[PDB]
Structure 1
């Protein structure tokens, strides 16, 4: 577990934020070559192999990554434009987003915004929404989001991870609770 986490974190940095810093040029869908990713990871962790990367992908509890044949991408979290063909979530009734309490005044005016990312990220799981919020501050609130409000306003909700969902933004009308 302790070797998988460090390598997985570098995988997220390369596939979500700065692939070009490792000489990788993603296609429009966010995929890079699996062999090219392995060599990029080896510049930092020389023991990494293709099999180890496949093990990381297969066992990742959030569904962070996707392999198609010999290509790989992050499924969410990107800070550069990507065209994603994820299935839409039409089943969830409520979604969750944890954020520092200090952001509540701004969020209740503008809704959730993507900030440095392409998409707003939310969750089907309360604990994980709150643990995500806790990365940004100690005093955190749980936002409860009416998923049908989002769909009625035209915002597609995409099944990006096992629990993670992404959407272009969350207007403040779609927030039913702040606890």
Structure 2
């Protein structure tokens, strides 16, 4: 209950609107941990640094990263950020879940970042489908040839446990839609 509310607000601050709370993330997307706790307290005042450190440690998707006294979101940003994730050179197939209503536009334009900086995909079929279900009920599973992306210059990076980021996904690299 309360853990999900604080995590949703953390993602809003660290991915989209930090300046709304007086925060200035560095080029790599990090903000001061102390600054984040004080920002969160203006909405939920009974939050501590230990409560936030428990969220980061127990995050099932690996959303957040703490380097000492700093904290950032690892992906999902809507403002420019210089990330240092490792490249995914092993995956052959990647997956992306999206409402079926988006398929005609995707089959002509490919996957675009839209309001975010990068296109997000997954190595896990269940995670991709759950991600698509956020936007609507009827969801299709897209299968993406990873080597198709690499041969066209689009490197894939390991942003989370199963989450992967890439600049875009041309339609020719989408092999299947189920």
* TM-score normalised by length of structure 2: 0.98
Partner-residue secondary structure (3-state), 1:144: strand
1:79 and 1:158 map into 2 onto residues whose CA distance is 17
Q: Could you give the per-residue CA deviations for residues 130-168 of structure 1, whole angstroms, max 9, x where no partner exists?
A: 111111121111000011111111111111011110100
2:155 and 2:53 map into 1 onto residues whose CA distance is 30
Structure 1, unpaired ranges of 5+: none
Q: Could you give the per-residue CA deviations for residues 82-101 of structure 1, whole angstroms, max 9, x where no partner exists?
A: 11111111111111001111
Structure 2, unpaired ranges of 5+: none
2:89 and 2:30 map into 1 onto residues whose CA distance is 26
Q: Would you say how many aligned residue pairs link Structure 1 and Structure 2?
A: 178
2:146 and 2:62 map into 1 onto residues whose CA distance is 21
Q: Could you give the per-residue CA deviations for residues 71-110 of structure 1, whole angstroms, max 9, x where no partner exists?
A: 1100000011111111111111111001111111111111
Q: CA deviation at 1:127?
A: 1.1
Partner-residue secondary structure (3-state), 2:157: coil
Q: CA deviation at 1:64?
A: 0.1
* TM-score normalised by length of structure 1: 0.97
Matching residue of 1:34: 33
1:51 and 1:88 map into 2 onto residues whose CA distance is 32
Matching residue of 1:128: 127
